């Protein structure tokens, strides 16, 4: 079926919750052993969130080469999206060594530090120009050049340097800041708004690597954003847009890792954001 009209079809019947259990159902089990290795039990924020082993990011490291992350690699649509954790404590080192190794050039964030009352993961990027930054373990050092801070979000400029070859890159930080520590936005223009910025940048183009995205455990929100790109661009790309079908995108993309998309809820206002995305591409 179409978007629009099995939108309303779904809620008229109020079915989201078979529509995403049936999802569930079918969603790919890969392995994920070097996630459970015990050596590995303090970089994984969650124990029932890890990459399968088939499209994990390696650290360039022959000690640990582990970090929660996997690439998700759109073949069709022709973009891949890095997605993690927000890091922990003992893994902000990693975090950025990895955004060093695969050559990307933007970090989008969609959480707070701190929601709910509770830590969501550690402040692993300066405040303040003059207090910056070193990872001692993997050699890295961290400065905030510029902080620009709107109403639904802040984007911010940082520089990386690998202090063992004193190289240096510019890397763009995406922050937003506005979704609700409970359910979703009521409306997805501040979210397509935040996305097309993101766009806008560069840092989602083949020229760079791979964008880096997280929220708390990098599956519920950060599947929002790149299930929204990805249908968005492949109804630019079609023939025949209303041929693109969200659910089979997700499913897609949840061969690469696990858990896309967590609640009923998500789903909805996933195609909400598509369906009102897809009349500003264009004119209306
Ligand atoms: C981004 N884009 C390019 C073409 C289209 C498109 O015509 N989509 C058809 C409908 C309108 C709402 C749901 O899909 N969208």
Same mark, same amino acid.
């Not at 990011?57 to 891949?80: C, G, P, V």
């Given at each position: 079926? @179409?978007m629009?009209?099995?939108? @309303?079809?779904?809620?008229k019947?109020?079915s ?5 259990? =049936? ?12 996630? &459970?290795?015990? &050596? ?10 890890s ?7 390696k ?33 902000? +080192? ?6 060093? @190794?695969?050559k990307?050039? +933007? ?7 701190? @929601?709910?009352?509770? !830590? ?10 003059? &207090? ?9 050092? !961290?400065?905030?050049?510029?902080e620009?801070? &709107? %109403? ?6 940082l ?44 840092? !989602? ?10 929220? %708390?455990?990098?599956? +519920?929100? %950060? ?16 023939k =025949? ?5 969200i659910?089979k995108? !997700? ?11 967590q609640?009923? =809820?998500?789903?909805?206002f ?15």
């Amino acid at each position: 079926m @179409e978007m629009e009209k099995e939108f @309303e079809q779904i809620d008229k019947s109020g079915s989201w919750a078979a529509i995403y259990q =049936d999802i569930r159902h079918e969603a790919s089990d890969f392995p994920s052993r070097v996630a &459970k290795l015990p &050596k590995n039990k303090n970089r994984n924020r969650y124990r029932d969130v890890s990459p399968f082993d088939h499209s994990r990011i390696k650290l360039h490291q022959e000690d640990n080469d582990y970090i929660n992350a996997s690439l998700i690699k759109m073949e069709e649509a022709q973009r891949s999206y890095i997605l993690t954790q927000g890091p922990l404590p003992n893994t902000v +080192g990693h975090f950025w060594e990895m955004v060093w @190794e695969q050559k990307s050039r +933007g970090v989008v964030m969609l959480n707070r530090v701190m @929601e709910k009352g509770s !830590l969501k993961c550690a402040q692993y990027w300066p405040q303040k120009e003059e &207090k910056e930054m070193i990872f001692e373990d993997t050699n890295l050092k !961290l400065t905030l050049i510029s902080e620009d801070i &709107k %109403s639904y979000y802040t984007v911010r400029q940082l520089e990386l340097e690998n202090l063992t070859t004193q190289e240096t890159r510019e890397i763009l930080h995406f922050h937003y800041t506005t979704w609700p520590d409970f359910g979703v936005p009521e409306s997805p223009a501040s979210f397509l708004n935040f996305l097309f910025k993101v766009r806008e940048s560069g840092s !989602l183009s083949p020229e760079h690597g791979p964008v880096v995205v997280h929220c %708390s455990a990098g599956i +519920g929100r %950060s599947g929002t954003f790149c299930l929204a790109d990805t249908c968005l661009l492949l109804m630019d790309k079609r023939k =025949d847009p209303s041929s693109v079908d969200i659910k089979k995108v !997700l499913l897609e993309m949840r061969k690469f890792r696990m858990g896309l998309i967590q609640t009923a =809820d998500q789903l909805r206002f996933s195609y909400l954001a598509v369906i009102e995305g897809a009349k500003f591409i264009m004119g209306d």
